[PDB]
């Protein structure tokens, strides 16, 4: 098995331009917020599994893992929001997070802001970073909560902190809800996915880094001619999808001797990660399944918005 | 009667091979994990009666009987969470079971996390086990309290032990909970029970590793063509119903004259342990009662979730 090879070839990490315009703008929001007068506040979207949370783990590798080793300063902040947080709920957990508290015995959500505000100075936090803005609306209505929205608003303009909100691309309405959230936060950003399999686009060079990236030593196959029609067959833009089938075709090639992904164990791949996919979305790897033109077309404007029709 | 037949008989243990995939990545957890840097915190499921704490004694033999005979080290521990644990609650109890300590007419909650954390390197911790994790649920509605699992992360990330948590297999939502508790915890496993009946099973070289086990010096007669039919029918993969409907043979047969588990004595352990079945299943030994195919049919998925689906 050799796990080291499994781990080396479940992390690995191709930066595609998007990514580092992303990384690029929060270096940008975290020295350019002075911490004296009114900060930037980014926003950031992107739809199911396209690689949301290793953006923000390469971002507090490349930004914080000197001055973790280094003592508790703990310059850049992770959180996620919990589902229908209040802001008691939100802030206790941003709360413990930081620093070394014990800080949620008491939920009284006025003293635990004097504690959080007294604290973000002193531990000198440079920038603080929310996964999921997706978890303040409503399941079975479209009502959004604000509580947490004023609330942040309040530790904005109480500590000039810069701020940077990733989320669902439906999650924005939420930030429609209030308007002074909506000037505060400017810079909001599109991390849709990859767009179209025609030829000379970024999904080539993505696919042979990946294809470098690979543990095996010789050439992965892929990124060919007939290749990448039936990998775009099998995700949509889909990155999580895409990476994860890739995976699992790796690990079957080295369960037994194969000197590459090849057209005997990719199937497998294929037969293993089709759960997830739709009714009418189709299964092209097993016998006959040619593609047609149509079936590599680009993904919608609502790719990240299927969580919201229903009411 | 002679007990030693009897505890022998009971004491009975057979390794299908999911069981020792558990216990090779259990070693490989033990060390794996450096001690210096972060760990891996392997979590495993299974429904009820699968085997889980015979795993886990297993494991406590073959890792900790040399060195718990050597001296005060106890490098493996084992630990069951009481029912709605209060984080308190859950880390005395994890306390006094370690060491040899006074350890909880004091319930302060971080100066009894200050003595663990400076006796988890003091006699040299190398793995913590943790049996129920199905008890942070709530009976009467399905709220869950992560009170432990931040806290469990707590003390994750403050020494770095590695954790094996056990638990049912609707259990996994706690998990849901806390999205840095799910990240935290890479490998989730499948203990689930025997799946067919149809033949060249691991069913079946599980029955006659059990069949050789048994007390009985030439033959126990079982896992032959129609007896794993109704031994199927009586339990579904029920590996506890199974064997204490087995163990609840061979002591019949060893109460008087009997030299093998045979049809007079076998059908009696049927009419005794057919309490826990439900109502639609069916009661097969007595006189006529003939198994239609429908009835060895694999188990579900939900099998180990019907303690959630009412509420
Ligand atoms: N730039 C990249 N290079 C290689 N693999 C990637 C890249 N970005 C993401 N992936 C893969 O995609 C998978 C999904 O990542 P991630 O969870 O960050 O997406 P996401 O949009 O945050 O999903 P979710 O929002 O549901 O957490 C990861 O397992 C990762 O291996
Ligand atoms: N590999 C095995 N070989 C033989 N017997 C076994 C094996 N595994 C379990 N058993 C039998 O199954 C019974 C139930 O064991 P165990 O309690 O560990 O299951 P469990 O899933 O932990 O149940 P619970 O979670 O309710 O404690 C035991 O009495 C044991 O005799």
């Not at 992390?11 to 917020?33: G, Q």
């Not at 949301?52 to 080793?69: E, M, R």
């Not at 690990?251 to 739709?278: C, R, Y």
Request: a neutral charge.
């Amino acid at each position: 098995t050799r796990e080291a090879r499994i781990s080396r070839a479940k992390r690995a990490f191709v930066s595609t331009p998007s990514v580092r315009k992303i990384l690029s703008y929060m270096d940008r929001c975290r020295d350019l917020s002075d911490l004296e007068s009114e900060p930037t506040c980014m926003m950031v979207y992107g739809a199911s599994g396209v690689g949301k949370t290793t953006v923000i783990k390469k971002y507090l590798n490349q930004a914080a893992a000197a001055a973790a080793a280094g003592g508790d300063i703990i310059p850049v902040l992770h959180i996620e929001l919990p589902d229908n947080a209040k802001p008691v709920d939100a802030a206790r957990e941003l709360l413990v997070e930081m620093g070394d508290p014990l800080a949620l015995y008491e939920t009284d959500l006025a003293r635990l802001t004097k504690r959080l505000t007294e604290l973000i100075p002193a531990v000198g936090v440079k920038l603080i970073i929310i996964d999921e803005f997706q978890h303040l609306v409503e399941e079975r209505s479209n009502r959004v909560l604000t509580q947490v929205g004023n609330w942040l608003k309040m530790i904005l303009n109480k500590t000039k902190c810069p701020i940077v909100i990733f989320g669902m691309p439906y999650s924005k309405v939420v930030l429609q809800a209030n308007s002074q959230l909506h000037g505060r936060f400017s810079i909001q950003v599109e991390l849709r996915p990859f767009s179209y399999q025609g030829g000379r686009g970024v999904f080539k060079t993505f696919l042979e880094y990946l294809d470098k990236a690979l543990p095996f030593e010789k050439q992965a196959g892929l990124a060919n001619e007939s290749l990448q029609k039936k990998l775009y067959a099998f995700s949509q833009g889909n990155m999580r999808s895409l990476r994860n089938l890739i995976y699992q075709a790796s690990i079957e090639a080295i369960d037994n001797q194969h000197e590459t992904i090849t057209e005997e164990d990719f199937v497998f791949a294929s037969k293993l990660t089709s759960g997830d996919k739709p009714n009418s979305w189709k299964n092209p790897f097993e016998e006959g399944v040619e593609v047609t033109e149509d079936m590599l077309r680009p993904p919608p404007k609502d790719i990240g918005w299927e969580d919201y029709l229903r009411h």
